[PDB]
Curated annotation (Swiss-Prot):
InterPro entries: Globin, Globin-like_sf, Myoglobin. It holds the Pfam family Globin. Keywords: Cytoplasm, Heme, Iron, Metal-binding, Muscle protein, Oxidoreductase, Oxygen transport, Phosphoprotein, Transport. Monomeric heme protein which primary function is to store oxygen and facilitate its diffusion within muscle tissues. Reversibly binds oxygen through a pentacoordinated heme iron and enables its timely and efficient release as needed during periods of heightened demand. Depending on the oxidative conditions of tissues and cells, and in addition to its ability to bind oxygen, it also has a nitrite reductase activity whereby it regulates the production of bioactive nitric oxide. This is Myoglobin. Its EC number is 1.7.-.-, 1.11.1.-. Changing G121A: In metmyoglobin. Nitrite binds at A64. It catalyses: Fe(III)-heme b-[protein] + nitric oxide + H2O = Fe(II)-heme b-[protein] + nitrite + 2 H(+); H2O2 + AH2 = A + 2 H2O. It comes from Physeter macrocephalus (Sperm whale).
């Protein structure tokens, strides 16, 4: 369970992401795909992309970036009271998309990497610790829901 102080560090760096969610989502997905190429296979619409240039030019990858960060943003803003937001998400990612928790760990890593690079103003060690806490919470609660749904994760 995060403190209010920890939530405010999360939400301060989020506020910067929101200046340009599409740009941040491009960087974050590209980092994910570069770091764990196996994750790209889950995206039938753009899993053929071969290079970072291709990725940066893909309108479909850009939309996905906006989707993930907007959904995550809405979750973070709930400050742990995210049961409603996680229901649909766990169901789709468990049952349709088939995303293991380890891939949720991979995108969490990419999120932290990009924020650390982009936002040294709002992503010092304390803020990064708070964001890691929030993302662990997210992954813990998703994992519990996956189990409920019958998915090993
Ligand atoms: C912070 C983590 C994540 C959040 C908040 C998130 C949220 C979403 C949302 C809102 C959608 C669209 C609605 C839906 O289908 O449920 C979506 C679709 C999808 N997500 Fe995620 N997601 C996350 C992580 C992942 C990861 C790590 C992968 C794969 C490695 C993944 C694969 C997909 C796929 C394949 C789709 C369908 C996209 C499409 O067909 O257009 N997601 N995700």
């Amino acid at each position: 369970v995060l403190s209010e102080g920890e939530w405010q560090l999360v939400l301060h760096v989020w506020a910067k992401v929101e200046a340009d969610v599409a740009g941040h989502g491009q960087d974050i997905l590209i980092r994910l795909f570069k770091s764990h190429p196996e994750t790209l296979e889950k995206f039938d619409r753009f899993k053929h992309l071969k290079t970072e240039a291709e990725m940066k030019a893909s309108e479909d990858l850009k939309k996905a970036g906006v989707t993930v960060l907007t959904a995550l943003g809405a979750i973070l803003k709930k400050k742990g009271h995210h049961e409603a937001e996680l229901k649909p998400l766990a169901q789709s990612h468990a049952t349709k998309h088939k995303i293991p928790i380890k891939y949720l760990e991979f995108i969490s890593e990419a999120i932290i990497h990009v924020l650390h690079s982009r936002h040294p103003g709002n992503f010092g060690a304390d803020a990064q610790g708070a964001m890691n806490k929030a993302l662990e919470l997210f992954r813990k609660d998703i994992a519990a829901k996956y189990k409920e749904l019958g998915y090993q994760g």
